[PDB]
Amino acid sequence: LTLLNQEMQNLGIEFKKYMSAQINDVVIGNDREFDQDFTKLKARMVAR
Amino acid sequence: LDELLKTFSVMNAYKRATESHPRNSTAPFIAVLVEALYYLANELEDAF
Amino acid sequence: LDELLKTFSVMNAYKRATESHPRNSTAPFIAVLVEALYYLANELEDAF
Amino acid sequence: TKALVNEARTECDRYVRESPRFYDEGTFSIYQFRQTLQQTSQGYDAQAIVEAEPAIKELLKLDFEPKVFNTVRKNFRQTVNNTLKTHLLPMAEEQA
Amino acid sequence: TKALVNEARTECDRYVRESPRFYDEGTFSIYQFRQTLQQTSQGYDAQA
Amino acid sequence: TKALVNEARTECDRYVRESPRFYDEGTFSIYQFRQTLQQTSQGYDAQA
């Protein structure tokens, strides 16, 4: 039981790391999928 | 040391800087130098 | 703004810099500028 | 989604305000209506005004070509990145 | 209330970016640290 | 093992402190950011 409680804590720590990494990559622009949409957005707006 | 500095990239240092400030999504344009020193030293320490 | 910058002290900015790096007990001698911007902006944001 | 929509509306509304370039006499003079009105348009049809369409289009382009490239290329990217980070991280901490 | 808070944060965050005036050498030169570092601060105290 | 680990960390941490050579203007000038910032980087992308 005490071992289980320790594992519960790690899940929270790991979850924050994964979420931060995903959000952080978008800021740097490493996420290629997000960039494609953004440039598409800019092109449409200028064309409009 | 030689391998680490030869493969050094400015973007990775910038990426680390943003994580250090969860309340902001930009950098002063100078923190890359600071993060490089900490990143360079901390990685070197781990090898030791 | 006027009160915050007039009471600004270099030591407090240095103190914040050290906390940002739990694996080190010194600073590159330049991070005070970076911490000042983050500290100055974050405090200003809270007032808003 | 609510915040971003407000950001766009609160920023696009400023475009209505006339820029200094809008009053550029060389590109277009507002008194040209006198030419169409000084015993030239005897009927209330607003038809002779069509002749001035090419000139005003240039004036709008000069006024509106800025305030749009500046917006999308400079500020819009920053707002999206900051908004996503500030709303997600506290949510993740709450979930933990 | 939610929208206005986002407006302030999304606008105050840009202040961190260094303005061209920030690099005004006449008002302050970043190399003054050499004066305090070129055999002038022999202790890692960050006092000078 | 404990003592040696402390010896390495207590010695590698000093590397973060900037050496006098770090401020060598000839090899690199910190004001080059003005060239990329004086109406040269209109987007907050940190790409130039």
Side-chain angles (χ1 to χ4, degrees), chain F:
Chain F
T1 304
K2 304 297 183 180
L4 302 183
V5 172
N6 177 268
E7 290 286 358
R9 178 173 299 97
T10 53
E11 188 173 14
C12 299
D13 57 0
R14 306 201 188 99
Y15 302 163
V16 307
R17 179 71 68 172
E18 78 298 0
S19 200
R21 305 173 304 277
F22 186 88
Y23 296 152
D24 187 0
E25 305 186 4
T27 57
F28 183 93
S29 53
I30 295 78
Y31 301 113
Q32 297 173 214
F33 300 164
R34 288 191 301 180
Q35 309 305 338
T36 63
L37 179 137
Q38 287 180 349
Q39 191 58 24
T40 303
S41 59
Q42 294 74 19
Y44 303 163
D45 303 330
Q47 185 57 216

Side-chain angles (χ1 to χ4, degrees), chain D residues 8-93:
Chain D
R9 178 173 299 97
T10 53
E11 188 173 14
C12 299
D13 57 0
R14 306 200 188 99
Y15 302 163
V16 307
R17 179 71 68 172
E18 78 298 0
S19 200
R21 305 173 304 277
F22 186 88
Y23 296 152
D24 187 0
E25 305 186 4
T27 57
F28 183 93
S29 53
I30 295 78
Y31 301 113
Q32 297 173 214
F33 300 164
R34 288 191 301 180
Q35 309 305 338
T36 63
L37 179 138
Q38 287 180 349
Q39 191 58 24
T40 303
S41 59
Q42 294 74 19
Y44 303 163
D45 303 330
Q47 185 57 216
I49 184 59
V50 179
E51 186 276 347
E53 178 177 357
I56 58 175
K57 292 174 65 176
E58 301 295 350
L59 175 57
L60 299 183
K61 190 180 186 301
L62 272 63
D63 184 5
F64 275 68
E65 178 179 2
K67 312 190 298 184
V68 184
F69 299 163
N70 172 30
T71 292
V72 304
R73 306 175 185 175
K74 194 177 182 179
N75 307 332
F76 193 80
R77 179 66 180 186
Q78 169 52 28
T79 58
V80 176
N81 303 18
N82 176 267
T83 299
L84 296 170
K85 195 182 191 188
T86 186
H87 280 76
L88 291 173
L89 297 179
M91 193 290 302
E93 198 284 335

